[PDB]
Amino acid sequence: NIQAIRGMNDYLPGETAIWQRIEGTLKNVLGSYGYSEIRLPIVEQTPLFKRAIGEVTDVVEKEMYTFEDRNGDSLTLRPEGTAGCVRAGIEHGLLYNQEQRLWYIGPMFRHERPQKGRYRQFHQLGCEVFGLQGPDIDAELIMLTARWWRALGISEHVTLELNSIGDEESREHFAGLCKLLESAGIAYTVNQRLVRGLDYYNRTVFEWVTNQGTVCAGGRYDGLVEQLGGRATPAVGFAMGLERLVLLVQAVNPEFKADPVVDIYLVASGADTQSAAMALAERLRDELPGVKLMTNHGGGNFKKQFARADKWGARVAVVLGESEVANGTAVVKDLRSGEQTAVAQDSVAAHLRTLLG
Amino acid sequence: NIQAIRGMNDYLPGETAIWQRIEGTLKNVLGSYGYSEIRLPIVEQTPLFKRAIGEVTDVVEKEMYTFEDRNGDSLTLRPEGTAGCVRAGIEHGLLYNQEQRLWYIGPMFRHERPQKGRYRQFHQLGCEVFGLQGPDIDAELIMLTARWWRALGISEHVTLELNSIGSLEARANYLDEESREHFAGLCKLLESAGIAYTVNQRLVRGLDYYNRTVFEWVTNQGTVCAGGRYDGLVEQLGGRATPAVGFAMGLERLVLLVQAVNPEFKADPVVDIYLVASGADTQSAAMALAERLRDELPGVKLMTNHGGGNFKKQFARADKWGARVAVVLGESEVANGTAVVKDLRSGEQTAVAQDSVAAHLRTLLG
Ligand SMILES: Nc1ncnc2c1ncn2[C@@H]1O[C@H](COP(=O)(O)OC(=O)[C@@H](N)Cc2c[nH]c[nH+]2)[C@@H](O)[C@H]1O
Ligand SMILES: Nc1ncnc2c1ncn2[C@@H]1O[C@H](COP(=O)(O)OC(=O)[C@@H](N)Cc2c[nH]c[nH+]2)[C@@H](O)[C@H]1O
């Protein structure tokens, strides 16, 4: 058996269920603010990360996954996604004299020693807005994170740190920023030693910390579009570690369940019943949009098939043996109470609607 | 300025909206069959691919992105996802004497020459079912793909090719009665469902782990979805023998095919309401009314103008985003507790009390 590269995790069926609920919530809250999705390559050229994050940084100094391509070109698996974003923005023409409100989700890679919060393949959701300069947009992004925390019920577990690393212009801009948050009741701490670990930020720097600590981090980087070869454009954004979010919800929120995988299990036994079973299932799929129905396969006597229905968390089992098939019926069994009734096939969909919701 | 690696694409805002509409439909139809999502690493050890896919195959021979790790270990960006799936299944204990019906979505990487169907970073959605043997689950998976095509409206544009390549023994003699029975049973299930298929005897797949059922859904770079059975692979990579069947589909080729054959499969506009706001110290009021209307209209796309701009600029910005309605806020509205509601489609603008704006928008949108 081959095993997994250390620090690269698999997310098994039970836990992805939770992952899909939290992502759906996050994308919804981004949708209500009018932010569009951009999808960017996993691999970029190594000079981008060297030129944008900075040469004397732990990321470039010791963390990147770099390798030589079949044409000599060095390629690096992205360690963060902002550089890639700016790059595509410049390349495609999306940023000059334009405003963009964007978000992205995907894997990032860093060769760090794995410990509980830190991984080699980890996933980030991040936002980047281009074209807005003043403190107002920076306050809209902090308002956006605050909403996500309310929505995931973790609000009384995340602290906001802020400060400027720029200066008159930056004293004014940071102050106006601080004024917008007071006037919204967002509680923040000005922490003068909060400099971030990447060298492209300038005025606003912030971090939402829990008590590996930082759950979300971001800031402003007004110069980076020009540095990577484009026209000067103001830009701000952040990225959050979806691994640490998932962990914090699950810990602070215990009663965060997700939807079970099967609702109705199609039990079927007897000679040549399986085409009938699969045909009934396809019809019930047409009739009950968005019902998780699973067709028993590989035989098994009724006792086995009913226990399999219990394994998946089915609430109702539709049964069919030869009799049902010849008589045009289907037996509907409410697995919660045992009450089973024979219904005509034409009427089973309505009988399930009643039993499920 | 740096550019993108040749054969690796960026999907910009306009096209990603189409991409989410097609993926929601696919995931919905998989959920109706009770299929669970699994998430797997993008980099695996190189021997996995060599062992599973086969040494003398074009993927191992000339396509993989391999590189050396800081400890000597050879690592390879995955070129396909089935190997990683079985590896995780065996490593975690999911497959022995169990039934799993899984799916996965993500990037695969192959060093090959850029074409219209072929890229170097591509994305697949694939399904893996473990524990079921007979032809009936193979027929469930071909039924699942047919439903997707009806749902995406591309049904009259994709053809099904099917064939059995038997077992090692029959191949090494070169199906064999057990594979003739299994295949026949499979062809019987599809005819009884009205799924039209072609038995194409030259159809062998390009990976060497497959055994009885082999199939491809082809359009007229051709193959949009491809799969087959692989009853031995779990033991080959270290686990106990378990029957397994699955497929994978090239999401780039699907998105291309829907867009072509279904010209106006249209996506969501990304803003519904634009909040216009000018005048002295209006912006905190503007951002506060925006937050409140978000609580009051769940799932409306509302964007707050920022950076000033005169009303004329701000209304044109509303047009850029496809907003239907603009809610306006000058100094006057702030003091009088109002907000102006302007129906951008007709110009009709009324002043509404801020407590009554949400209801006025509900009426105007849907
Ligand atoms: N290894 C590892 N594991 C888990 N989570 C990890 C992680 N490395 C980072 N993170 C998470 O990501 C956020 C932010 O990471 P930083 O390296 O602190 O900063 C950035 O990536 C910037 N790109 C942010 C940005 C985007 N636009 C502007 N600025 C960590 O806090 C952690 O949760
Ligand atoms: N380069 C490139 N670009 C885009 N789409 C691409 C592509 N290379 C392949 N594809 C898409 O993937 C399917 C299948 O490709 P194959 O290399 O033929 O094989 C497989 O992936 C198997 N893993 C399938 C499987 C999974 N479980 C069981 N069997 C192509 O048809 C094309 O659409």
Q: DSSP per residue over B152-176, as a string? A: HT-GGG-EEEEEE---HHHHHH---
Interface of A with B in 2-21 (CB under 8 A): 2-5, 8-13, 16-17, 19-20
Q: Does residue A287 sit at the B interface (CB-CB below 8 Å)? A: no
Residue B299's domain is classified under what CATH number? 3.40.50.800
Q: Which two tokens stand for residue A70?
A: 């079949």
Burial bucket for residue A21 (CB in 10 Å: 0-12, 13-18, 19+):
middle
Residue B36 Cα to ligand 2 midpoint, Å, equals 21
Sign of the alpha-carbon dihedral angle for B281, B282, B285, B286: negative
Q: Which two tokens stand for residue A142?
A: 């902090």
Residue B248 Cα to ligand 2 midpoint, Å, equals 6
Deposited resolution, Å: 2.6
Cβ B95 vs Cβ B130: under 8 Å: yes
CB contact under 8 A, B16 and A8: no
CB contact under 8 A, A143 and B287: yes
Q: Which two tokens stand for residue B232?
A: 């031995």
How close A195 gets to chain B, by Cα (Å)? 26
- Residue owning tokens 């103001």: A234
First to last CA, chain B: 46
- Residue owning tokens 């860093």: A110
Separation of alpha carbons B246 and B10, rounded Å: 29
Separation of alpha carbons A104 and A122, rounded Å: 14
Separation of alpha carbons A118 and A241, rounded Å: 10
**Closest to B12 (Cβ–Cβ): which among A8, A92, A289?**
A92
Question: Does residue B226 line the site of ligand 2, with CB under 6 A?
Answer: yes
Interface of A with B in 95-124 (CB under 8 A): 99, 101-102, 107, 109, 111, 121
Question: Does residue B219 line the site of ligand 2, with CB under 6 A?
Answer: no
Domain shared by A333 and A268, yes or no: yes
State the method.
X-ray
Nearest CA-CA partner of A246 in A19, A37, A86: A19
Cβ A158 vs Cβ A149: under 8 Å: yes
First to last CA, chain A: 45
Q: Does residue B75 sit at the A interface (CB-CB below 8 Å)? A: yes
> What amino acid is encoded at A271 in this protein?
A
Burial bucket for residue A69 (CB in 10 Å: 0-12, 13-18, 19+):
middle
Cβ B98 vs Cβ B129: under 8 Å: no
CB contact under 8 A, A41 and B1: no
Residue B2 Rama label (left phi>0; alpha psi -120 to 50; beta): beta
Of A258, A287, A308, the domain-final residue: A258
Q: Does residue A153 sit at the B interface (CB-CB below 8 Å)? A: no
Nearest CA-CA partner of B335 in B289, B296, B285, B294: B285
Cβ B213 vs Cβ B109: under 8 Å: no
Of A258, A273, A295, the domain-final residue: A258
Interface test with B, best of A12, A86, A225, A274 (most B CBs within 10 A): A12
What are the DSSP calls for A184-224, one per residue? TT--EEE-TT---SSTT--SEEEEEEE---EEEEEEE-TTH
| Residues 6+ positions from A97 with CB-CB distance below 8 Å | A131
Range of the domain at A344: 259-355
Question: Does residue B224 line the site of ligand 2, with CB under 6 A?
Answer: yes
What are the DSSP calls for B59-113, one per residue? IIIII-EEEE-TTS-EEEE-S-SHHHHHHHHHHHT-STT--EEEEEEEEEE----
Q: Does residue A186 sit at the B interface (CB-CB below 8 Å)? A: no
Q: Which two tokens stand for residue B287?
A: 């951002």
Q: Does residue B194 sit at the A interface (CB-CB below 8 Å)? A: no
Interface of A with B in 314-333 (CB under 8 A): none
Cβ B139 vs Cβ B193: under 8 Å: yes
Domain shared by A252 and A273, yes or no: no
Residue A40's domain is classified under what CATH number? 3.30.930.10
Half-sphere exposure of residue B121: CA atoms within 13 angstroms, side-chain side: 18
Cβ A245 vs Cβ A152: under 8 Å: yes
Q: Give the rounded distance of the alpha carbon of B330 from its chain centre.
A: 44
Cβ A315 vs Cβ A263: under 8 Å: yes
How close B339 gets to chain A, by Cα (Å)? 19
Cβ of B232: how many Cβ atoms within 10 Å?
Answer: 17
Measured in degrees and rounded to the nearest 5, phi and psi for residue B57 equal -150, 150
Q: Which two tokens stand for residue A47?
A: 């000079």
Give the CA angle between residues B46, B217, B145 to the nearest 5°: 95
Q: How many domains does chain A have?
A: 2
Q: Which SS3 state, helix, strand or coil, does residue A263 take?
A: coil
Q: Does residue B235 sit at the A interface (CB-CB below 8 Å)? A: no
Question: Does residue B246 line the site of ligand 2, with CB under 6 A?
Answer: yes
How close A341 gets to chain B, by Cα (Å)? 24
Q: Which residue lies with its CA nearest to atom 7 of ligand 1?
A: A118
Separation of alpha carbons A60 and A76, rounded Å: 10
Interface test with B, best of A8, A22, A39 (most B CBs within 10 A): A39
Domain shared by B248 and B297, yes or no: no
> What amino acid is encoded at B231 in this protein?
D
What are the DSSP calls for B193-248, one per residue? TT---EE-TT---SSTT--SEEEEEE----EEEEEEE-TTHHHHTTS----EEEEE
Nearest CA-CA partner of A219 in A231, A241, A234: A234
How close B172 gets to chain A, by Cα (Å)? 26
Of A201, A224, A258, the domain-final residue: A258
CB contact under 8 A, A67 and B70: no
Nearest CA-CA partner of A64 in A1, A19, A110, A105: A110
Domain shared by B11 and B71, yes or no: yes
Domain shared by A243 and A271, yes or no: no
H or E stretch including A241? strand A235-241
Pairing of strands B273-277, B302-304: parallel
Separation of alpha carbons A322 and B243, rounded Å: 28
Measured in degrees and rounded to the nearest 5, phi and psi for residue B139 equal -70, -35
Q: Tell me the ligand closest to A104's alpha carbon.
A: 1
Q: Which two tokens stand for residue B70?
A: 């800081």
Which residues in B lie closer than 8 A to residue A137 (C-beta atoms)? Answer: 306-307
Domain shared by B24 and B78, yes or no: yes
Cβ B40 vs Cβ B86: under 8 Å: no
Separation of alpha carbons B326 and B364, rounded Å: 11
Residues in chain B: 366
CA dihedral B205, B207, B211, B212 (to 10 degrees): -20
Residue A239 Cα to ligand 1 midpoint, Å, equals 6
Interface test with B, best of A3, A5, A9, A10 (most B CBs within 10 A): A10
Q: Which SS3 state, helix, strand or coil, does residue B258 take?
A: helix
Nearest CA-CA partner of B122 in B291, B252, B271: B252
Interface of B with A in 37-66 (CB under 8 A): 37-45, 47-48, 51, 65
Nearest CA-CA partner of A244 in A214, A218, A219, A211: A214
Nearest CA-CA partner of B316 in B307, B329, B326, B330: B326
Separation of alpha carbons A310 and A318, rounded Å: 13
Cβ B96 vs Cβ B62: under 8 Å: no
Cβ B30 vs Cβ B249: under 8 Å: no
What are the DSSP calls for B19-41, one per residue? HHHHHHHHHHHHHTTTPEE-B--
Measured in degrees and rounded to the nearest 5, phi and psi for residue A239 equal -150, 145
SS percent in chain B: helix, strand, coil, step 5: 40, 25, 40
Domain shared by A250 and A269, yes or no: no
Sheet architecture: strand order including A214-220: A36-37, A100-109, A121-130, A235-241, A214-220, A204-210, A158-164, A188-190
Q: Please report, for residues A38, B3, B77, B84, B119, the alpha-carbon distance to residue B10 in angstroms, rounded to integers and kept in the order given.
A: 8, 11, 19, 25, 12
Domain shared by A131 and A218, yes or no: yes
Domain shared by B174 and B209, yes or no: yes
- Residue owning tokens 């699973």: A294
How close A214 gets to chain B, by Cα (Å)? 24
Q: Which two tokens stand for residue B225?
A: 């979805």
Cβ B225 vs Cβ B248: under 8 Å: yes
CB contact under 8 A, B287 and A139: yes
Q: Which parts of B275-323 fold into alpha helices (H)?
A: 283-296, 311-321
Q: Please report, for residues A42, B82, B168, B170, B207, the alpha-carbon distance to residue B230 in angstroms, rounded to integers and kept in the order given.
A: 30, 10, 12, 15, 10
Cβ A107 vs Cβ A239: under 8 Å: no
Q: Which two tokens stand for residue B159?
A: 């053809």
Nearest CA-CA partner of A246 in A9, A1, A21: A21
Nearest CA-CA partner of A200 in A172, A174, A227: A227
Measured in degrees and rounded to the nearest 5, phi and psi for residue B348 equal -55, 110
Separation of alpha carbons A138 and A111, rounded Å: 31
H or E stretch including A354? helix A348-356
**Closest to B47 (Cβ–Cβ): which among A2, A131, A298?**
A2
Separation of alpha carbons A26 and A18, rounded Å: 13
Domain shared by B77 and B126, yes or no: yes
Domain shared by B323 and B174, yes or no: no
Domain shared by B172 and B274, yes or no: no
Separation of alpha carbons B65 and B79, rounded Å: 8
Q: Which SS3 state, helix, strand or coil, does residue A142 take?
A: helix
Cβ of A161: how many Cβ atoms within 10 Å?
Answer: 17
Separation of alpha carbons B265 and B251, rounded Å: 16
